[PDB]
């Protein structure tokens, strides 16, 4: 998935 | 000035559980969104993305490695311990804990995610044989 | 997963040279992508971070560009220290994927 700090 | 540093077993049999410690200084794992993560580097090969752990207590893992690995930290001794179970020989490695800066902050307000994008500072990393 | 491929995964060059290497992404991973260069013996050692950062300490000789599926590293002018094995990270989605890695090594 994204990151935690992703969009 | 932030050092991290690997300790554990050198040698592990099959089957075997290895727990391995991050010992660490220079920023505290309660630091806004601060993260460790564990990589490792089977000999010759590249490098392999294990798993990290930020300060508000997220964890994320390798998929192919979730079922084996528990990440967890100990802020107040400023450690990170990475737990791999039922290990076999492909598991013999050199693995690297690192450190991976949260977002900067002006007054306490988040300005700036670029400094995430990078683990920033690696400890020398520690060479695990996995043999019976 | 998302697929990182370093190119060339070798490349041989000489002090003096500017060389420059390649990562490309399966899927955008817009610009959280870092670089770094790993002497035999040593852990990993930053130099870009967010595609195109210079890391404090880091000598201006190298330099990183590109976002979303293609990013590349350039050093400018090899010197010595130079000759090693260059990895890209992706940090966009997890799990946070390694290149292959370039090995950089003496012309001969």
């Known amino acids: 998935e994204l990151d935690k700090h992703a969009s | 000035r932030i050092t991290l540093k690997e300790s554990g077993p050198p040698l592990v049999k099959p089957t075997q559980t290895l727990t391995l410690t991050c010992s660490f200084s220079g920023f505290s794992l309660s630091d806004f969104g601060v993260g460790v993560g564990w990589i490792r580097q089977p000999p010759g090969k590249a490098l392999e993305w294990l798993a990290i752990i930020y300060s508000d207590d997220d964890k994320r893992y390798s998929p192919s490695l979730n079922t084996r690995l528990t990440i967890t930290k100990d802020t107040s001794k400023n450690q990170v311990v990475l737990v791999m179970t039922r290990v076999s020989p492909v598991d013999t490695a050199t693995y690297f804990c690192a450190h991976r800066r949260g977002p900067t902050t002006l007054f306490g307000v988040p300005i700036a995610r670029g400094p995430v994008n990078a683990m920033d500072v690696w400890g020398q990393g520690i060479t695990v044989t996995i043999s019976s | 997963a998302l697929q990182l491929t370093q190119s060339p995964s070798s490349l041989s060059a000489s002090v003096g040279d500017r060389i420059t290497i390649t990562c490309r992404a399966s899927?955008?991973?817009?610009?959280?992508l870092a670089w770094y260069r790993q002497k035999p013996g040593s852990p990993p050692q930053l130099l870009i971070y967010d595609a195109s950062s210079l890391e404090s300490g880091v000598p201006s000789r190298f330099s990183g560009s590109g976002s979303g599926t293609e990013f590349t590293l350039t050093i400018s002018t090899l010197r010595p220290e130079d000759f090693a094995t260059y990895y890209c990270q992706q940090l966009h989605f997890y799990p946070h994927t390694f290149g292959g890695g370039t090995r950089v090594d003496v012309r001969r």
């Open positions: 899927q955008g991973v817009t610009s959280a």
